Design a protein around this ligand. Sequence first.
Ligand SMILES: *[C@@H]1O[C@H](CO)[C@@H](O[C@@H]2O[C@H](CO)[C@@H](O[C@@H]3O[C@H](CO)[C@@H](O)[C@H](O)[C@@H]3O)[C@H](O)[C@H]2NC(C)=O)[C@H](O)[C@H]1NC(C)=O
Ligand SMILES: *[C@@H]1O[C@H](CO)[C@@H](O[C@@H]2O[C@H](CO)[C@@H](O[C@@H]3O[C@H](CO)[C@@H](O)[C@H](O)[C@@H]3O)[C@H](O)[C@H]2NC(C)=O)[C@H](O)[C@H]1NC(C)=O
Ligand SMILES: *[C@@H]1O[C@H](CO)[C@@H](O[C@@H]2O[C@H](CO)[C@@H](O[C@@H]3O[C@H](CO)[C@@H](O)[C@H](O)[C@@H]3O)[C@H](O)[C@H]2NC(C)=O)[C@H](O)[C@H]1NC(C)=O
Ligand SMILES: *[C@@H]1O[C@H](CO)[C@@H](O[C@@H]2O[C@H](CO)[C@@H](O[C@@H]3O[C@H](CO)[C@@H](O)[C@H](O)[C@@H]3O)[C@H](O)[C@H]2NC(C)=O)[C@H](O)[C@H]1NC(C)=O
Ligand SMILES: *[C@@H]1O[C@H](CO)[C@@H](O[C@@H]2O[C@H](CO)[C@@H](O)[C@H](O)[C@H]2NC(C)=O)[C@H](O)[C@H]1NC(C)=O
Ligand SMILES: *[C@@H]1O[C@H](CO)[C@@H](O[C@@H]2O[C@H](CO)[C@@H](O)[C@H](O)[C@H]2NC(C)=O)[C@H](O)[C@H]1NC(C)=O
Lengths: 59, 106, 159, 53
Amino acid sequence: NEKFHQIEKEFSEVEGRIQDLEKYVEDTKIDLWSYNAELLVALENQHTIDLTDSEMNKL
Amino acid sequence: TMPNNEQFDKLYIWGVHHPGTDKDQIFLYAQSSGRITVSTKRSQQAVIPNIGSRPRIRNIPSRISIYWTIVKPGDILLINSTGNLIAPRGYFKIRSGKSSIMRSDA
Amino acid sequence: SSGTLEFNNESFNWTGVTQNGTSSACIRRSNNSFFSRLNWLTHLNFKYPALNVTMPNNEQFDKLYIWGVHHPGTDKDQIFLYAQSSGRITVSTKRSQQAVIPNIGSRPRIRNIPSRISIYWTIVKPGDILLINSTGNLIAPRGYFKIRSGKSSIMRSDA
Amino acid sequence: GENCTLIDALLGDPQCDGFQNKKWDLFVERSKAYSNCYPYDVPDYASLRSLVA
Ligand SMILES: *[C@@H]1O[C@H](CO)[C@@H](O[C@@H]2O[C@H](CO)[C@@H](O[C@@H]3O[C@H](CO)[C@@H](O)[C@H](O)[C@@H]3O)[C@H](O)[C@H]2NC(C)=O)[C@H](O)[C@H]1NC(C)=O
Ligand SMILES: *[C@@H]1O[C@H](CO)[C@@H](O[C@@H]2O[C@H](CO)[C@@H](O[C@@H]3O[C@H](CO)[C@@H](O)[C@H](O)[C@@H]3O)[C@H](O)[C@H]2NC(C)=O)[C@H](O)[C@H]1NC(C)=O
Ligand SMILES: *[C@@H]1O[C@H](CO)[C@@H](O[C@@H]2O[C@H](CO)[C@@H](O[C@@H]3O[C@H](CO)[C@@H](O)[C@H](O)[C@@H]3O)[C@H](O)[C@H]2NC(C)=O)[C@H](O)[C@H]1NC(C)=O
Ligand SMILES: *[C@@H]1O[C@H](CO)[C@@H](O[C@@H]2O[C@H](CO)[C@@H](O[C@@H]3O[C@H](CO)[C@@H](O)[C@H](O)[C@@H]3O)[C@H](O)[C@H]2NC(C)=O)[C@H](O)[C@H]1NC(C)=O
Ligand SMILES: *[C@@H]1O[C@H](CO)[C@@H](O[C@@H]2O[C@H](CO)[C@@H](O)[C@H](O)[C@H]2NC(C)=O)[C@H](O)[C@H]1NC(C)=O
Ligand SMILES: *[C@@H]1O[C@H](CO)[C@@H](O[C@@H]2O[C@H](CO)[C@@H](O)[C@H](O)[C@H]2NC(C)=O)[C@H](O)[C@H]1NC(C)=O
């Protein structure tokens, strides 16, 4: 899906509160999505193995 | 005064000149202080110049502070000043779209 | 996040003013005193000349300057400390500028002091120059803080 | 906008006269960009940059 305009994620200056919050938000998002990606890949690969073995046993 | 009678928001970019010394202020504006109040029906911004020396950049020890003001349709932009005003020449069409900016050397 | 109070004194040319002002609320070793890292500037011979002081940055790290503005409680206090009914402080660099105006007025007494100090800070990158311009009420800095980029933090706890 | 920032093209820095009245979808700011006109600063610089973008 498309995403066009977002917050800034790199900073060349020292601003404090808002910078801290933006970094926290992006980091939280990244960690949650990485967790989701690892879990989805693990689950889908387990399902692939299971379906192949099930087809062998079916035959 | 400047009215807004079109059907889109208008964006005004203006500024305030902080000269470096007092003789510069008297030379450019003939009075030791300015005051700029730019306002509309739903907004007002007053800015006061700060005469003082800044570290020279391109041999300039003065500065310009840039401000902006958005004016919705049917509204009126009012500019009130006694000096040090860096006035606008017109307006920017401000659209609502899917554009963005990105810093890259690619 | 800096994680250090590394402080390096610097020698500003406060010619024409009385440095090292003190107070009876800030008691240090049974003596009237003040913040250790700041310098309270008062008049000298009933004259507060126009301060215009430059300080370059020629090292390879960012410098952090902590300074302040003194809001006295009354008008006679302003005339007593600075010999003129108003101040104005413009601290600037090539990429920044901050102008602060004192607000003479009475505040609720704290440690019997009805005046106040507003603390400001200014970061100066290498190759830049710090410029201080003032006519009074300046609580000048004494030097700079090394500002590091690290994995330090702060936490409020009674543990 | 290789030698120009969006704000410079906005105000009208003389090296940016190409960008007058131009539209876009993505503005590419270079690390070589620099301003050459009168010295200035913008309170809420990031906010004006974001809304203009
Ligand atoms: C307050 O003090 C500052 C610095 O102490 C003053 O700024 C400095 O002014 C001098 C001369 O006006 C500048 O030197 C000049 O440099 C140019 C560069 O080519 C040269 O052509 C001149 O012959 C002269 O050497 C110096 O660059 C400048 N420093 C900074 C950081 O801007 C300032 O003028 C003082 N304020 C007042 C009101 O006097
Ligand atoms: C905002 O804009 C208004 C509109 O011009 C300004 O009001 C005008 O201000 C000037 C100078 O401040 C006044 O001129 C003086 O008026 C006195 C009145 O006694 C006269 O004796 C002087 O010789 C001089 O002419 C002018 O009268 C005044 N106009 C009105 C209708 O009040 C105002 O100064 C502006 N303020 C800012 C902050 O920009
Ligand atoms: C504006 O009004 C306020 C309050 O009405 C004034 O502040 C008050 O000043 C009085 C006397 O200056 C303070 O009382 C003193 O308390 C000390 C405490 O030990 C005592 O030693 C003195 O004998 C006296 O009783 C009072 O605490 C203080 N109140 C606050 C909240 O600070 C203020 O001075 C007025 N401003 C001017 C310009 O007069
Ligand atoms: C920023 O720092 C500069 C550098 O000192 C200050 O400029 C100086 O300001 C004083 C008082 O404002 C001026 O003294 C007066 O000058 C007039 C000139 O006609 C003279 O007739 C008076 O008897 C008195 O001596 C001084 O000339 C001036 N220097 C320069 C080079 O302009 C300025 O006041 C400071 N501003 C702030 C906001 O700190
Ligand atoms: C103001 O007080 C500071 C210390 O609080 C003085 O700093 C001393 O300066 C001299 C040279 O000027 C040095 O030899 C000392 O080592 C410094 N002492 C400390 C503790 O840093 C400063 O001299 C005082 N200035 C005036 C005008 O009294
Ligand atoms: C962007 O800026 C650079 C540097 O200001 C330009 O490179 C200059 O090109 C001119 C002529 O092409 C030369 O006279 C200069 O000597 C060059 N600079 C240097 C440092 O050598 C470049 O042409 C600019 N490009 C655009 C598109 O604005």
